[PDB]
Design an enzyme around this catalytic site. Structure first.
Site, mmCIF file in Angstrom:
data_model
loop_
_atom_site.group_PDB
_atom_site.id
_atom_site.type_symbol
_atom_site.label_atom_id
_atom_site.label_comp_id
_atom_site.label_asym_id
_atom_site.label_seq_id
_atom_site.Cartn_x
_atom_site.Cartn_y
_atom_site.Cartn_z
ATOM 1 C CB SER A 526 -1.049 -0.105 1.131
ATOM 2 O OG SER A 526 -2.195 0.699 0.830
ATOM 3 C CG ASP A 601 -6.389 -2.956 -4.276
ATOM 4 O OD1 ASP A 601 -7.079 -2.174 -3.604
ATOM 5 O OD2 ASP A 601 -5.154 -3.081 -4.089
ATOM 6 C CG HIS A 633 -5.253 -2.756 -0.496
ATOM 7 N ND1 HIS A 633 -4.486 -2.404 -1.590
ATOM 8 C CD2 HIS A 633 -4.661 -2.172 0.584
ATOM 9 C CE1 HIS A 633 -3.470 -1.649 -1.190
ATOM 10 N NE2 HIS A 633 -3.573 -1.469 0.118
#
Lengths: 655, 655
Positions: A526, A601, A633
């Site tokens: 991320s 995602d 994600h």
């Protein structure tokens, strides 16, 4: 572990596979309970004070009073479970089904059922009711808000018809099927949220008259105790102004602005107003306005009575009041940013009293009556210690727990030469000081997170260390629970300071004799995937190998409500966006980097990693790739084994 | 190379950067031509007999007569170029723009222009006019067919509103944009094609009355010389019947079925009817009905006069007739399936005469008058030899060309122990017989292709060999130009025989002392990617490393018109489909395999490789991946350098 440890009335309660055990000892068995059912299991606690829970069963929900040991109501929500929001009265539940908001009423044992009421009827792909909005920023986790006596249900209405969507593709059907995801990117038109209030007695709906600009963010909805006023913390597109406004619940009319907060960089309201016990006129508001998250005492005209907590530390959880509302209970970093303790403070302010003095991480639950606390403690030397305390005095220990890789911890200076950064270092299994070892920097580095705390402990560092690789992490500036100044240095300049501080981590690693300076790698997810990629492109002579999962690569493609806080809008900040746009620097990839993405995602859209591979094609550079077509994600559940093995083997192959 | 070598009238012509040179010597310069333009360059030859070409310029098309050296017409097609189809009269052009079919009329130098005529007006995403249909199977390359005197334009109309589409995603815009690809998968509803005929004199359109089933395949549209009849080769869904039918061009009415072909496995018409010179009543039809592609002489009632060519070899190009229509000229495999020669045969049949006797690959152009041939020849010892021959006799050589890896060629037995397979083997650069070398099988193995011919030569084998890796290819059964029996063994059983034969290739490699039997890899694209993956899963102890590009992984997800020919429909053949469904055997991946896909691939949809990675996640096996987000089925142009380096490094890293 002590399964489900929590308060019910004046009892603390936990499961023993078969029993639910109460202490102030009584024991309630799964068979005792099963005998009371219409047609020890899992439940959701609705009202800790009353010990009211709901049981998820084949054919509907069964409410249950654990203190009385009696069924309350059966609920039929047509199998909807994700959006369930029970009335504080306990006999109705709101939920969203096929685009619309409903209220279902509980049915008493063998007294028949009633059809749910449709609050809305025109929900659609571009018109969302009763769900989270603003990409779950500003503490928003849901889109339904019951008035405290159950007379009204406030709810969000999000018109996203002006937002240009991203395709999310399901590859499992014979022919793959796309569904639009209304993910508003930085600098683009935002969605338009309004707030409806459905009055149960009359079946009438009124919308708050929140006015223009329609893109304004409507956050931290908070009802007055008397149900006459709904308060909203409104944040502007720039995210440098927050107005706490009162609206009339009967008509939707604007009543008054209580107070406004502003900031050089950004304001970020994250918590609702919390009214004092028995009071319709005074409430606690959390605010980071002085540089540190603190508790403020206001009246409902907007007059600030006093800042209740203060200091160069942050309140990290507000737990509530004594029955009289003369004391506040909360978790904070006062002892150390690496620790969490539970405190008491007089409403008049002044000196805190630490109720959980032992050095490490305490997670604490204040009893419904505010007279006692369950405490769950862990430290590098203590795996788990569970205490129950009658607030001053009398602590009763309920549980205490007692080759693996060595974990070292310490401090280094940030790149400013002044700010202390805390690091943790997981040493190779069977570490030998005579030997040289490869090392992987595990990085996140983004706002809201703090990876280095004084805990006992998701174990990827340990797996890597078992393969002979040291893993190092440092909480660089930008990270959390160190005050606003420490975080806001990143404003308009994402990656820059974060990387400078991570390179201080590398300087420290290179000062260790046992570190092979030519075998340094990097991994993160991320913001951590952005950081992994940015560090390889920026410091390509240092970072030989990396793995970047769900990485942000072009911040112009991140969601408005997060990205514009830290970066401002793309039109306002081309220099900063350009410097962080990893697509522009793909030609600087000279090591081995695997990008990993879940195809569906909805947080970091797949396009980020795909465009990086595309940019590398044009730039003639050579990353590697893996896609989890069934994952969002993060890779969750058993498939996480596959993920760890894919990441680990990439490092053992190339680093 | 001799740029653009071709016939114009009775001259052969080629470019010399600046000049266009004619011989039967005249020379025509780019400046001579430039002086004649309204407001040596590239052109498209429209009519070789008349030397009529079209020049693509800024602001429109300029037709040019190269024999007269005069501009013919200027054409305005609103910048449409892909779908251009000029009338045989030379003064009109059909094209498709924004879903619809148009005819533009040429404008004479300084005589003004006319607005194009819209043949259709309701073209749309699900209603396609004037384009290729049936996934370009059955020799279909376009969707416009001018009558031979230019009086009418026949065209396809494809209603694909019943076909469930696949998303093709463009990742380059800020938010990615999906467009549906109407790709009809095996066993699903096919599109409905009809044939319209637009009559230029009256502006009327009639549709052929092709009737039911609406899914029937309408192929090899062929006009009668007198323009009264349009012939169509209609193929049923099973692909085991082809009816050649005559339709009235004025009314669209069915006239008669001339003849029907059927086959145990499949019929596959690939070429139009070709009428004899000066005849409206006799034509040549290509057919593989006797096991080998041959030329058949028919009259228009459907009566077969005679099979003109015959033998256990195949006609590979029908080049045309002598002016009298008493002789046929064609390319074939008669000399050897590894070779192509050009032949003459009497229309009455009998003995062929080889006009290009030298052993190797000849590519030959018969002059417009049928009196001479341009020949371009290559062999393992001859890079390029360009001849011009006045047909019997007098050959005039126009051009002849004269450490690299050694190429060895030979034959092995197929797995039947009877059928000879031909192989080519590219040896490591600087090969040393005392040394052991890794080897990569480069595989395709699918129908219609033949990879091993007696040529001089897309050089990936040479690049690999330069890195010290031998590359081996064998044309296994299923491959082309060896007759139907050799190909059709694969029917209903894709992969099975092909792999058995490829393993005979491996047996041969293992019999070489210089082959490291523990370092065998495999690479291929498309059917070759299916074969690469299938060989790794099926023979995982042999194939250590593979790279599979645009691979078919589940044949239920391949297009109806190709897949159902070789495999039958999924409902008719669950055992065969199941055995070839590589998703079911992902747990057998024990080596290193990289899959590569272009994201916008409309041939093998991206879903194939994504689902394989998904299956490997569940099966806990560990492939690698690369995606070219800007590419379709193959990586084309400069980016092909990136592709070769990605594939090569995968092998040098792991094999």
């Amino acid at each position: 572990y002590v399964v489900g440890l929590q308060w019910m009335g004046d009892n603390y309660v936990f499961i023993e596979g078969d029993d639910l055990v109460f202490n102030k000892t009584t024991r309630f068995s799964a068979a005792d309970l099963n005998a009371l059912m219409p047609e020890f299991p899992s439940f959701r606690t609705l009202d800790a004070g009353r010990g009211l829970v709901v049981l998820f069963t084949q054919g509907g929900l069964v409410g249950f009073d654990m203190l009385a040991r009696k069924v309350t109501y059966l609920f039929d929500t047509n199998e909807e479970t994700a959006s369930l929001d029970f009335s504080p009265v306990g006999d109705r539940v709101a939920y969203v089904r096929n685009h619309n908001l409903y209220i279902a009423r509980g049915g008493k044992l063998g007294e028949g059922m009633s059809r749910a009421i449709a609050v809305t009827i025109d929900g659609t792909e571009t018109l969302v009711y009763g769900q989270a909005v603003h990409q779950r920023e500003f503490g928003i986790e849901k889109g339904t808000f019951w008035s405290p006596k159950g007379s009204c249900l406030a709810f969000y209405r999000m018109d996203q018809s002006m937002v240009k969507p991203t395709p999310i593709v399901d590859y499992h059907p014979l022919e793959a099927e796309s569904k639009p995801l209304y993910y508003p990117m930085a600098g683009t038109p935002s969605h338009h949220v309004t707030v409806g209030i459905y009055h149960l007695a009359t079946g009438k709906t009124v919308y708050l008259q929140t006015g223009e600009p329609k893109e304004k963010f409507l956050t931290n909805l908070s009802w007055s105790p008397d149900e006459n006023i709904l308060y909203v913390a409104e944040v502007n597109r720039a995210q440098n102004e927050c107005k706490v406004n009162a609206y009339d619940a009967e008509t939707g009319r604007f009543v008054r602005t209580l107070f406004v907060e502003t900031d050089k960089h950004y304001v970020e309201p994250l918590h609702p107003l919390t009214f004092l016990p028995g009071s319709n006129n005074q409430f606690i508001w959390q605010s980071r306005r002085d540089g540190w998250n603190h508790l403020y005492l206001y009246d409902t005209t907007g007059r600030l009575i006093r800042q209740v907590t203060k200091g160069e530390w942050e309140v990290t959880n507000f737990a509530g009041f004594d029955p009289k509302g003369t004391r506040l209970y909360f978790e904070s970093t006062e002892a150390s940013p690496l620790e969490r303790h539970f405190y008491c403070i007089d409403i008049k302010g002044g000196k805190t009293k630490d109720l959980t003095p032992e050095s490490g991480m305490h997670r604490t639950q204040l009893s419904p009556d505010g007279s006692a606390i369950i405490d769950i403690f862990q430290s590098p030397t203590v795996p788990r210690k569970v205490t129950v305390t009658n607030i001053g005095k009398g602590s009763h220990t309920l549980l205490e727990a007692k080759a693996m890789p060595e974990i070292r911890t310490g401090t280094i200076m940030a790149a400013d030469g002044q700010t202390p950064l805390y690091y943790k270092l997981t040493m190779p299994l069977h570490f030998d000081p005579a030997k040289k070892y490869p090392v992987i920097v595990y990085v996140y580095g983004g706002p809201h997170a703090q990876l280095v705390t004084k805990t006992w402990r998701g174990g990827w560092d340990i797996y890597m260390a078992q393969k002979g690789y040291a893993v190092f992490t440092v909480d660089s500036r930008g990270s959390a629970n160190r005050g606003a100044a420490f975080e806001q240095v990143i404003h308009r300049r994402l990656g820059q300071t974060e990387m400078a501080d991570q390179m201080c981590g590398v300087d420290f690693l290179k000062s260790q004799s046992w570190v092979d300076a030519d075998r340094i790698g990097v991994h993160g997810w991320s913001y951590g995937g952005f950081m992994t990629t940015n560090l390889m492109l920026t410091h390509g002579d240092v970072f030989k190998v990396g793995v970047a999962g769900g990485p942000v690569i072009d911040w112009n493609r991140y969601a408005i409500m997060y990205g514009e806080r830290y970066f401002d809008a793309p039109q306002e900040n081309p220099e900063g966006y350009d410097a962080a746009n990893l697509l522009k620097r793909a030609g600087d990839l000279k090591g081995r980097l695997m990008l990993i993405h879940g195809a569906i995602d909805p947080v970091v859209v797949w396009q980020h990693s795909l465009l990086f591979l595309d940019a590398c094609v044009k730039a003639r550079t050579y990353p590697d790739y893996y896609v989890y077509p069934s994952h969002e994600h993060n890779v969750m559940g058993p498939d996480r084994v596959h993920l760890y093995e894919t990441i680990t083997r990439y490092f053992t192959d190339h680093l």
